[PDB]
């Protein structure tokens, strides 16, 4: 029914500028207001502003005037937002949602939202990750199980697909969120199996970084 499809992940260097879209369908594009909301990693929702495709009226959250510019194309039923003078504080997820035009009643809200367009502001260039096996040492055993690990370091941009033994070993796995380390992402993952299964039965780490078409397999050795 009512559908709001947004552009894909965008990568930009500081100072630069970008323009993302939101394609609406299933309703009269010119009967609603198109709003834009921002959300940084682990942060809350912050209203940016809105525009009325019908006549082109726009309302902005003072904070964003000079950073965000809203636009629309009735002929294509698509909303556009342009962010300028990009900085690190601009890296976040941006959602588009709709709000009804006044016509009496109380049904005014953000009933439909877009899936969100991720924007990452960085100067780093495409970088394939280094994969390091984490073999256990005395003390890395608990109960009748042992813990193994894999370290993915220095890659850009996100994401990376990490599996164990081609995907067959999925339980007892802990893949942690990537974090920054010199403008490059670093990620970790642990796997816990029955102490008897290792190392009689090999355990391998599988890393894939689409951006660089890289594929690395690291077998954990004692």
């Amino acid at each position: 029914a009512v559908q709001l499809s947004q552009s894909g992940t965008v990568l930009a260097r500081p100072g630069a500028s970008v323009k993302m879209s939101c394609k609406a369908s299933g309703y009269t594009f010119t009967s609603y207001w198109m709003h834009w909301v921002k959300q940084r990693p682990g942060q809350g929702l912050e209203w940016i502003g809105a525009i009325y495709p019908g006549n082109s009226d726009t309302s902005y959250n003072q904070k964003f005037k000079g950073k965000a510019k809203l636009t629309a194309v009735t002929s294509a039923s698509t909303a556009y937002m342009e962010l300028s003078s990009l900085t690190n504080e601009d890296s976040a997820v941006y959602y588009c949602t709709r709000w009804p035009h006044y016509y009496g009643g109380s049904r005014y809200y953000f009933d439909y939202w877009g899936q969100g367009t991720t924007l990452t502001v960085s100067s780093a260039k495409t970088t394939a990750p280094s994969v390091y096996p984490l073999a256990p040492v005395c003390g890395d055993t608990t109960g009748s199980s042992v813990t193994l690990g894999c370290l993915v370091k220095g890659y850009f941009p996100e994401p990376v697909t990490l599996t164990w033994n081609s995907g067959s070993l999925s339980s007892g796995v802990h893949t942690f969120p990537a974090v920054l380390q010199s403008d490059l992402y670093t990620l970790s993952s642990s796997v816990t199996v029955t102490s008897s299964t290792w190392p009689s039965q090999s355990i391998t780490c599988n890393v894939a970084h689409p951006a660089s078409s890289t594929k690395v397999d690291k077998k954990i050795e004692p």
Binding site: G44, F176, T186, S190
Partner: protein
Amino acid sequence: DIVMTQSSSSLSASLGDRVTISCRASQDISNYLNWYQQKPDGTVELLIYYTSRLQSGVPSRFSGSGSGSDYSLTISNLVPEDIATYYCQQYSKLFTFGSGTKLEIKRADAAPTVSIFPPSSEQLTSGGASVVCFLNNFYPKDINVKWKIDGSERQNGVLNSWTDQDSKDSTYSMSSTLTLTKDEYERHNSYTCEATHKTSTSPIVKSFNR
């Protein structure tokens, strides 16, 4: 501009519980306040509108109330899918979203299972030395990790990452990495990561020597 504030930063409850989330405006917003739900996947959903009106298709488990500057969201009985982050929104004067409040399920207390890992030979040849320490499956979420090299605490060069509550066992897990230069790592013998958690007064110690 009107500021919204949800004192409730993180809420812990049990399945079947009756949970209530607060929201406060800087001024009377005349009941112009909506409630939204954001699932861990990032999906956002409209729950209640105009303070107390339940949106179509939303489980009757949800309801809103309040007036003036104080408003709140209540869930009759909590179910697995309700575990998410909730935001309130005022629309009396432009638009403003609350700070947000996340829900988490209660479970039995669990001490972290700690394991430490020395730098791989591959990374060492690259001139780098990373020491990793896993603190898996613990509860509550509050946990403190400390690194020591040859018995001396070290803060610099430590990066941490936290997973969200597990959807199966409701536990939490942490990963701490101590990155040093190959030379530094080769100057010292013992590396230790200690975990401090509600489940005990004495820290969980994991260490190794070269």
